[PDB]
Symmetry: D2
Subunit: 328 residues, 4 copies
């Protein structure tokens, strides 16, 4: 069964890419409209983004807690910019407050040098090694270990957590991107590798280069893929939807459009097609070892109902369950 995730557009949303035409204001009330739509439709979770152009994701995720019952929140976590101890207490609180629905996604991100804006100036090599030190402590702190640590970048003493998360050993850990050295910090520490939506070929390959660097540390790793979606009644209708999405400003693979990448942000590619054809490329990707799909659409409210109504009926989607209350 597949784990279908939607997305919280906390950087902004709308009907058209590249322009304020058809724009859609984003506030907690709209963000809650999407999270609840997702909770209601069967999505396992929702990816909540990171970056200084986005409302803070921990806050956004935690404010959706009393209003959803089974949706999980995939909060993007930038190692380098925060203490691993703090990050382990926040992660613990998120998991507890939501009763086991916290999920974390490690991010380091190359461009821009936004790190500077946040008092971080490590080299591409230093951030990737600090990231590795960060999540080692984090992984250890979330397992009840009192941690004394002082490597190149991270330095803590008697680091201990008074209250544990609920998921075990710790809330799952996801890692996106590709790079090269990136894949390593993952193969050695994360539970699932997130990859941009590329043609099956380039993707089958990255699954190997990843699965291998993981096996070398004798560990199993999962895969998810981040795609944009533009599904409709018919392909005719879907290509038109796609063109119009770009109309205020590419099929690099069967029903794979980089039209969405024609702008400085997002999922670069989108599965454009009718119901059975998008289902087809989706499964195809699942045949390659992808068990999770982080989809998206503009606008995200209406589009989550489309992928949920046109796609889900044609897929073996993993339907999440509301967890029972922890006994008092």
């Amino acid at each position: 069964s597949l784990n279908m995730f939607w997305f919280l557009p906390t950087h902004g949303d709308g009907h058209y890419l590249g322009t304020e035409e058809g724009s859609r204001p984003v506030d907690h009330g709209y963000l809650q409209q999407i999270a609840q739509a997702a909770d209601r439709l069967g999505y396992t979770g929702v990816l909540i983004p990171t970056g200084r152009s986005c409302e803070d994701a921990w806050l956004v995720a935690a404010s959706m807690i009393p209003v959803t019952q089974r949706l999980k929140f995939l909060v993007a976590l930038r190692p380098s910019v925060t203490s691993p101890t703090v990050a382990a207490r926040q992660a613990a609180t998120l998991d507890r407050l939501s009763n086991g629905r916290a999920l974390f996604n490690l991010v380091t991100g190359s461009d821009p040098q936004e790190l500077a804006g946040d008092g971080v100036f490590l080299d591409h090599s230093e951030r990737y090694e600090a990231s590795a030190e960060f999540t080692q402590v984090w992984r250890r702190l979330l397992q009840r270990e009192t941690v004394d640590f002082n490597g190149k970048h991270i330095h803590v003493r008697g680091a201990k957590l008074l209250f544990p998360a609920i998921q075990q050993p710790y809330p799952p850990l996801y890692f996106g991107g590709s790079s090269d050295v990136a894949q390593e910090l993952a193969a050695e520490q994360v539970d699932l590798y997130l990859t941009w939506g590329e043609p099956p070929e380039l993707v089958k390959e990255k699954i190997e280069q990843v699965r291998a660097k993981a096996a070398a540390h004798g560990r199993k790793i999962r895969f998810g893929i981040r795609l944009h979606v533009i599904v409709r009644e018919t392909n005719d209708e879907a290509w038109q939807a796609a063109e119009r999405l770009i109309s205020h400003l590419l099929e690099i693979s069967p029903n794979l459009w980089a039209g969405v990448g024609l702008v400085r942000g997002g999922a670069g590619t989108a599965l454009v097609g009718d119901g059975p054809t998008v289902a087809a490329r989706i499964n195809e990707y699942a045949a390659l070892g992808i068990d999770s799909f982080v989809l998206s659409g503009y606008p995200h409210l209406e589009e989550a109902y489309r992928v949920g109504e046109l796609l889900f009926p044609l897929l073996d989607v993993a339907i999440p369950e509301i967890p029972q209350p922890q006994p008092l």
Copy 2:
């Protein structure tokens, strides 16, 4: 009018101090019970504490957003472990998602080996040093400025917020500290000075200083007092309740009990008496020039009802109002 605040006991709650007896489990559902209590009884806001013994305050606070309409959240802000930038982004996000209901509280940090846990190893001098840098950058950042600042502790380059907070010039900033270096930082940068409950005299003097040290900097500051409360219908039942509270393990001033201080839990003093009395002492404090009172009790849900039913009626309370949604 007086601004009455309550407390979210994110560290734990119960009817007894120092033992697991009569304890009460704290979780999202019980914190919401109190938050929602506070919102309806008319408390202006609610203070949410900081420390390794506490669920993370930002998350806890953000989680009460969709479920309270007027209540404000006094959240702890830590100048050392977090970049002033992120902290500026979080403050803004919190303020926007709640539509203007965020307030911050500066916590410089103490001992023993706790800060060592978050990887911050600085001297009592250096921390108050880092705080001033920190809040100078945070305040500036929340005012749409771009920042390049390199002091003894804070190094930020090109730091700027893409999205603005709602309140101007920024979400109020509260601060405490009997320390000498502290009242200074407060008189210069903070909006409200927060002091523990103490006999009228000892507090007059603390208010005397600060109000002067502030004016010298060409500004008017505000004062609030953190008292634990134990009101009842008679003084006899009050003392009885006070005595009961400790029963499993002091009156430094007319109906001002230090009993609550026996254990390193919560505030140190507590008004203890019937209504008209506690009101009266509340009014003395008011007279000094204190417009805000951050009360608390055990257990914190039943007590919020106690202070809202026996005390509010005898006081001139500022009724918080629900902010109209921002225009779309």
Copy 3:
């Protein structure tokens, strides 16, 4: 300023009229998605329908109470089938629980003889006279009057309300339809007359025949109109939307389609056009004395965001306010 209402499709919803293709399941979670969309977008209220094919409207309306803050609920009330006393206690509770957001719409309805299914067999003449007796008691009970009454159809003794509604003299009363004798029960007792969306002509006339029968009792009466809406970027796009809405099975006035009436239920007509043109026919109707507009669309979630994003910016819409809490 205009009072814009949306609609809660408690009989079912979807993308296409007359067929289960594109259908959309309706539950409390979806019904809450629409109510909240409406609360968030600026709609004064939402019309919640009556009939044995619909989830009970009082229940649906009351279950949206803790989740909305300013939306009003227009609950359809069929006089003949329930006691006026009960109906006055339920109306009182709805208004109190929502803090003044209850609105009631009187309905009698001709076809079908569904009344039978509910133990009601009065003649067309008997229901219209029982309706009149019903709301006379209702109007009186909601004004604190102890009521002794026994006419043809209604009979009560010592009828009194222990708790009053909040709106005064009573929650507003709306009346739909047309008929002839119908207009009378309205002109003599209701606050606003609801009329099906007909061309400006036939509508200007009904406003008179109504305004007159009201003036005869020396009272003022308001008007609202119930239309379906199909608004888009351009008229080209909107006519296509319209055709496709019917595609699984008429412009009786400029941009007025009875296509939607091509099925056994709904608003018979729909304003089909781009933004400025729908705005135009809307104002036109307002020029005639319509101060309230009950709009609708398929699906109702997505369509409420369309009318809210394409239409509202072009109209002088009355933006509702969240009412402050009744003081304790």
Copy 4:
């Protein structure tokens, strides 16, 4: 396991009986405080009363839906003033909107001149007559049947539900009545018999009868007892609390106080004692064959916490669970 229920004091609440002193205002926000209390403490359901002194139970109940996840609602059903059909539609809507959490309680009605208020003028014989007709039609209607029934009071033709309830064969039906005609109606049509708290003996006998009068009709019925509770840590504090409760205006059996009956408010008896004692008496009752206990207290929020913290631990409580959302 025992099924513990609580009470929504829609008529009023406070710490004292018979006077406005120590009173507490009841509104949606406080009822939700208790409903939400009940949901988290593990009470199976909550009883919401009927009468002119009460906010309407259906509305009150429906309003707690989006905010509770497992708690059930015991709502009053009135056979005389409402058609059995509507009542069938409402029951179904309530059951569906809450996803299977509705339970009904039959109330036949008493004196004095109250029914006269709702336009129902029938004799003590005729009302129990109308009840049986009523619930026979309601039960049949909730089982997808079409109905034509003309008895001494209920006249229905072609009555049928377009949408089904969730629970089968229908939402449980509870009933009370010491009356002779009552235990009969109960043994034949109801799911659970509800009796006031009485000394073990007097209740054994009532249970003896009913269990027989039911089997004769070829069916197993269930029993529940409506007790007011006053548990504390010692019996002394209990009696003290019991005495305090009346202080502004009796032990018919070991720790079974009739004091709560001095005023026509709530139930007539009340268990009064420390934990292990009250548990014990709860267990006696259990033994008789009572699986459900509908408790209450003053004020009803603080008390639900009292009974859930001092009593539950000493009992074998049936932990309600959250129902998984119906498949889409």
